[PDB]
């Protein structure tokens, strides 16, 4: 019951999936061969961690996950890597030719050749669920597969699973590690196409994560490995309510109730703390008050934007580790006085708190220090629209000259799809303005 299926699409989605599932295994005590000595019910059960892992009669704990990519080389590393025994071969799906950073090839030319097989593989995971809750979809905005194939898959999932909830973790592009000039095109195309098919999407700005690694972990030139280990801690914080249980645990769907006031306004801003190196953590124990204060430092946000210049429609605090309500309440009171969080006038101003007592975990050989307590803030702020505005501006500069558009038209797309997507983004930006205006 309450199973969740994860779908990792394209290089970014797959490599972030690698990091997440490795971290889940460490959190739950699951070995690389899938054995979990602590689980005394063999071949099944309804424990919290069973939302993310099925079980075989031989005691293997198998991620409820599909990895899909239109070329083989990234998923091939999963097939030969440390956690290869974790997955059945059928969960790792690859084509031979990728989308060449082209939404049109991911959604149409190449993607259409593998979509039926992917849905078939997803259906086999669903059929093993007694109460499937929904999907978690990991992908880049910028790649041809992450953009085009994800939108195709999300459309097909709406048809095949109705209004079953679909959540996204979406990698927003940054020039420091981007690989295509057309990533603004792919980003707008997929955001337009997926908007009505996604219930909630957590954008991760690669530049925000890059800056955090540089500034907080003293990493000179962060790699995807550096970025993905930090991303997995945020993902783990968000999903920990699904995988563990406890008295103070609050289900992600309960936060979602507060986070999504209108169907299109479904893009929470995540902020995570503490991100500190072993060298700095050695001296200092970071208290509940300290990590809570850090949640309101813009430098710790997963998306670059200024919430001080916007209005809040929700604020959720997801704590994990050595944390008790008394300290949270005190920390929040201090922040209410010294910070002037401004809410829109139509929603309550309380902060919604959950606590998972399971302590945070780190992967061996990483840069993050192991800490006794951590927190992920999820806020619904009008400021997140600033991320759309930066993308829309880059889209506009190129599209005015129709630069690179022939690559999409050559694959069967029409200019009408670009303007339709951009108009949808203009309406979304307008939506975020409207919800921030005071009532009558």
């Amino acid at each position: 019951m309450r199973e969740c299926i994860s779908i990792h699409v394209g290089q970014a989605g797959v490599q972030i999936g690698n990091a997440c599932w490795e971290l889940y295994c460490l959190e739950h005590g699951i070995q690389p061969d899938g054995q979990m000595p602590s689980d005394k019910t063999i071949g099944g059960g309804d424990d919290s961690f069973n939302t993310f892992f099925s079980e075989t009669g031989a005691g293997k704990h198998v991620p409820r996950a599909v990895f899909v990519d239109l070329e083989p080389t990234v998923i091939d590393e999963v097939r030969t890597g440390t956690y290869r025994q974790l997955f059945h071969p059928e969960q790792l799906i690859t084509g031979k030719e990728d989308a060449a950073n082209n939404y049109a090839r991911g959604h149409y030319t190449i993607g259409k050749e593998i979509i039926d097989l992917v849905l078939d593989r997803i259906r086999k995971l669903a059929d093993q669920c007694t109460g499937l809750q929904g999907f978690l979809v990991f992908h880049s905005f910028g790649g041809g597969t992450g953009s085009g194939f994800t939108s195709l898959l999300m459309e097909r999932l709406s048809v095949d699973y109705g209004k079953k909830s679909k959540l996204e973790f979406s990698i927003y592009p940054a020039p420091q590690v981007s690989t295509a000039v057309v990533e603004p095109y792919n980003s707008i195309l997929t955001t337009h196409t997926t908007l009505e098919h996604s219930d909630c999407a957590f954008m991760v700005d690669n530049e925000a994560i890059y800056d955090i690694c540089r500034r907080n972990l003293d990493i000179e030139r962060p790699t995807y490995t550096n970025l993905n280990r930090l991303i997995s801690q945020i993902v783990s914080s968000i999903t920990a309510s699904l995988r563990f249980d406890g008295a103070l645990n609050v289900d992600l769907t309960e936060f979602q109730t507060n986070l999504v006031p209108y169907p299109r306004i479904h893009f929470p801003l995540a902020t995570y703390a503490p991100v500190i190196s072993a060298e700095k953590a050695y001296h200092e124990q970071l208290s509940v008050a300290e990590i809570t204060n850090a949640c309101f430092e813009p430098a710790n946000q997963m998306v670059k934007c200024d919430p001080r210049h916007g209005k809040y429609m929700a604020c959720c605090l997801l704590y994990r580790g050595d944390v008790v309500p008394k300290d949270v309440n005190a920390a929040i009171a201090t922040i209410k006085t010294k910070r002037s969080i401004q809410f829109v006038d139509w929603c309550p101003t309380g902060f919604k708190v959950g606590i998972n007592y399971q302590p945070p975990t780190v992967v061996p050989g990483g840069d993050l220090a192991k800490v006794q307590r951590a927190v992920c803030m999820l806020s619904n702020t009008t400021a997140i629209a600033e991320a759309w505005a930066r993308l829309d501006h880059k889209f506009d500069l190129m599209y005015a000259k129709r630069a690179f558009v022939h690559w999409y038209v050559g694959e069967g797309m029409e200019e009408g799809e670009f303007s339709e997507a951009r108009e949808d983004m203009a309406a979304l930006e307008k939506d975020y303005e409207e919800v921030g205006v005071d009532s009558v």
Binding site: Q176, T179, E220, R221, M398, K401, R402
Partner: protein, 421 residues
């Protein structure tokens, strides 16, 4: 594997092609007998891009050698890496092209093209996932220019959804005194604008000037010029041949470099000809360009930069930012983030560090304006036209070629002058 099929046509094409295979064979640890004798697994990671794997652990360049006379290929076969090429991939005629684009494209070349296609088909049919083709040739001769562009059109008919990439050697009076080179070059460019996805403009004018001015060679030889060409070709194919994130195959390269289908003529560059700041500054200096064009006479649509060797990635990132910021006027503002940078740990032979530059600059119009000026100077007096009409050509085809190349110049100027506001 994403295989590339290599074709080299004519004297220049086979000469440049042979050196290319010598250089990258050395880089991948392949010896003249086809056996691997390297030290790093990175050398074999993507070896299938350019080599077939035969029994006995033999690596055979996926390469086809075309020419209408036997001479050049005979010396290739007895060259350094002659025995490495597949004997059956040599396709040569006898009549020769006589430096006549019409003979290469319409007559002698047309009688041989079917034989070449048979070899292309056999190489492509055993490809796991064919990327496309790369052609080496000159534009000033007869076989490489005329038959080379014919091969492109015929291949495109059978592989219309594959990338076509050429290394095209532009003629200069400083290297060859053959008078009808501007005719052959203009007729060839007429084809390249329509039927290739990306063309590296290897300009003998720039190669001579580099050797004479910079390297101080009073009398540069084709060997000297080809040293520059092979080092450049190695550089611009590094991202295709080694594991990496950026421009790792022909199609992603084109998607990053070609904002409008006709503007696909690249200005390559190489440094050095040493610190990371100096390497980047050199890389953007006109003296280091393999096309005789000054980038400060135009604006960059897109740029690819490849650094090779052990160096600070942080410093490369800072210096590439610094160069763009201080030269912002020369990068079109309506293509954000149009300069992409890749780093390869493996340096080229004989250097601790190197940089290779691929620019899509509107200043490439200077190259075409030079060819056009020489073309019209001969065409205004209908000089030497009988060599071409004698093959069946009508002078209207010359007018259309001239016109199409003039339109290309106007097109590069349109986007040079375009503004964001």
């Amino acid at each position: 594997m994403r295989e590339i099929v290599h074709i080299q046509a004519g004297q220049c094409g086979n000469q440049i092609g042979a050196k290319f295979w010598e250089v990258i064979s050395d880089e991948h640890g392949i010896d003249p007998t086809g056996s691997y004798h390297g030290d790093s697994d990175l050398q074999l990671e993507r070896i299938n891009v350019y080599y077939n794997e035969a029994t006995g652990n033999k690596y055979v360049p996926r390469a086809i050698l075309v020419d209408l006379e036997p001479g050049t290929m005979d010396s290739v076969r007895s060259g350094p890496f002659g025995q490495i090429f597949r004997p059956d991939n040599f396709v040569f005629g006898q009549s020769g092209a006589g430096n006549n684009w019409a003979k290469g494209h319409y007559t002698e070349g047309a009688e041989l093209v079917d034989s070449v296609l048979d070899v292309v088909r056999k190489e492509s049919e055993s490809c796991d996932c064919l990327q496309g083709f790369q052609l080496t040739h000159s534009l000033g001769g007869g076989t490489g220019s005329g038959m080379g562009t014919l091969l492109i059109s015929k291949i495109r008919e059978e592989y219309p959804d594959r990338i076509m990439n050429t290394f095209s050697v532009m003629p200069s009076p400083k290297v060859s005194d053959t008078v009808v080179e501007p005719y052959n070059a203009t007729l060839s460019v007429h084809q390249l604008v329509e039927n290739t996805d990306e063309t590296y403009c290897i300009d003998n004018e720039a190669l001579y000037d580099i050797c004479f001015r910079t390297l101080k060679l009073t009398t540069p030889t084709y060997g000297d010029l080809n040293h520059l060409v092979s080092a450049t070709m190695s550089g611009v194919t590094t991202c295709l041949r080694f594991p990496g994130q950026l421009n790792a195959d022909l199609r992603k390269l084109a998607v990053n470099m070609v904002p409008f289908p006709r503007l696909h003529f690249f200005m390559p560059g190489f440094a050095p000809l040493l610190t990371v700041p100096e390497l980047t500054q050199q890389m953007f200096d006109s003296k280091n360009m393999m096309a005789a064009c000054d980038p400060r006479h135009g604006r960059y649509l897109t740029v690819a930069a490849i650094f090779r060797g052990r160096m600070s990635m942080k410093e490369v990132d800072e210096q590439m930012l610094n160069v763009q910021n201080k030269n912002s006027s020369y990068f079109v503002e309506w293509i954000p983030n149009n300069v992409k940078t890749a780093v390869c740990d493996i340096p080229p032979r004989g250097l601790k560090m190197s940089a290779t530059f691929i620019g899509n600059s509107t200043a490439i119009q200077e190259l075409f304006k030079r060819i056009s000026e020489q073309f019209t100077a001969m065409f205004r007096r209908k000089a030497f036209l009988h060599w071409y009409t004698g093959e069946g050509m009508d002078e209207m085809e010359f007018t259309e070629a001239e016109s199409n190349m003039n339109d290309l110049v106007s097109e590069y100027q349109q986007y040079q002058d375009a503004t964001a506001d």
